[PDB]
Design a protein around this ligand. Structure first.
Ligand SMILES: COc1cc(-c2cnc3c(N4CCOCC4)snc3c2)ccc1N
Lengths: 262, 120
């Protein structure tokens, strides 16, 4: 019964309008600034263990560190409610972000009655996704997502892709001598599955033998789904290729995916 | 280490072409060239990912240089066309872990001895 309440994240005071997603440890709600009228996403995570406290704070720290990027959900603020104050009796963490328009897959579902996605549309979706992941792998040390899938991509109000869900992400702490791989290449394998899925509307786990539509993406799919992680492309190898594909097709791949706006 | 054997290059007229080749003593996943012009930084010029044939170029040579490889994946070739004074440099064959960082930073595992290219 969290819907209906009013909450305060510092300067901000705001009202809980409805549920957007339920799940395991967490729930997501639509929320409105009661003074300013501006709307927000609000994630509420429950903890009854110090272990969970650590995982939740880590997720908040990652969200904060990665904010500012056009393909990562914008962090607004965070807060906590102690076991003593909460309606659950557990500690509660509250994460405030910009509110996207909804889930990418819901918009694709609307359009898949209308035929396969054009290459330009695949290109925009996938580039914007890869640019979010590039922002993570460029951190020092790099941040590995570890849970990339097409279901946790959002579509912004501007019609762009927004990556969220940093609950599985990891990195190295107390980084002062190296650039060993530390997991980047698992994220790339996952991205290759997404490009495959967007083209052929099936999970890969073979590219169809006579496809003349998405042929432009075939070499990049195979190179991301390389079994040997050393052979497998880096995110910079992928993005560079996506940029040249876009230029050849006269597409600005950062632009709104207007077709998905209907 | 892998041993790299380089040939081709030399002197040419502006607007002309030359070809470099580089043979490696074993398989490696990625091979390319970087160069160093008089007083300039090391500059990654071209790189090829062997299993996919994806090819990477700096903006300075895009549309003028073409890197390729043989079926045995032992050798790479660089065709340098529409050459100009800016392309005068020593060109070094190299292997790398990442073609994109190679073009951006000339980051390599191993580098060859180098071939002089002089335009005009
Ligand atoms: C506006 O309607 C929706 C919005 C969302 C949705 C879910 N999570 C969001 C956001 N998150 C921010 C990170 O915390 C959890 C997910 S940001 N904007 C979101 C929008 C999902 C489904 C619907 N239908």
């Amino acid at each position: 019964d969290f819907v209906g309440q009013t909450v305060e994240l510092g300067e901000l005071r705001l009202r809980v309008r409805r549920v957007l997603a339920e799940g395991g440890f967490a729930f997501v709600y639509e929320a409105q600034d009661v003074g300013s009228g501006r709307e927000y996403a609000l994630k509420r995570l429950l903890s009854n263990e110090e272990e969970k406290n650590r995982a939740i704070i880590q997720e908040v720290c990652f969200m904060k560190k990665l904010s500012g990027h056009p393909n990562i959900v914008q962090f607004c603020s965070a807060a906590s409610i102690g076991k003593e104050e909460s309606d659950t009796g557990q500690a509660e963490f509250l994460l405030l972000t910009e509110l996207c328009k909804g889930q990418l897959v819901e918009f694709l579902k609307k359009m898949e009655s209308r035929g396969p996605l054009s290459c330009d549309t695949v290109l925009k979706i996938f580039y914007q996704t890869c640019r979010a992941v590039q922002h993570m792998h460029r951190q020092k040390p790099p941040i590995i997502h570890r849970d990339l899938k097409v279901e946790n991509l959002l579509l912004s109000n501007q019609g762009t892709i927004k990556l969220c869900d940093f609950g599985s992400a990891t990195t190295i702490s107390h980084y002062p001598y190296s650039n060993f791989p530390i997991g980047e290449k698992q994220d790339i394998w996952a991205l290759g599955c997404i490009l495959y899925l967007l083209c052929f509307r099936q999970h890969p786990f073979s590219i169809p033998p006579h496809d003349t539509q998405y042929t432009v993406f075939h070499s990049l799919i195979r190179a991301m789904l390389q079994v040997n992680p050393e052979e497998r492309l880096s995110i910079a190898e992928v993005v560079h290729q996506l940029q040249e594909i876009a230029a050849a097709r006269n597409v600005n791949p950062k632009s709104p995916i207007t077709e998905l706006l209907e | 280490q892998v041993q790299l054997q380089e040939s081709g290059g030399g002197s040419v007229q502006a607007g002309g072409s030359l070809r470099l080749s580089c043979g490696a003593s074993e398989y490696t996943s990625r091979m390319g060239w970087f160069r160093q012009a008089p007083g300039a930084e090391r500059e990654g010029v071209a790189c090829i990912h062997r299993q996919s044939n994806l090819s990477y170029y700096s903006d300075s040579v895009r549309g003028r240089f073409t890197i390729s490889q043989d079926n045995a994946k032992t050798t790479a070739f660089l065709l340098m066309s529409s050459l100009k004074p800016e392309d005068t440099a020593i060109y070094y064959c190299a292997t790398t872990t990442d073609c994109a960082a190679f073009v951006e930073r000339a980051t390599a595992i191993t580098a060859g001895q180098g071939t002089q290219v002089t335009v005009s």
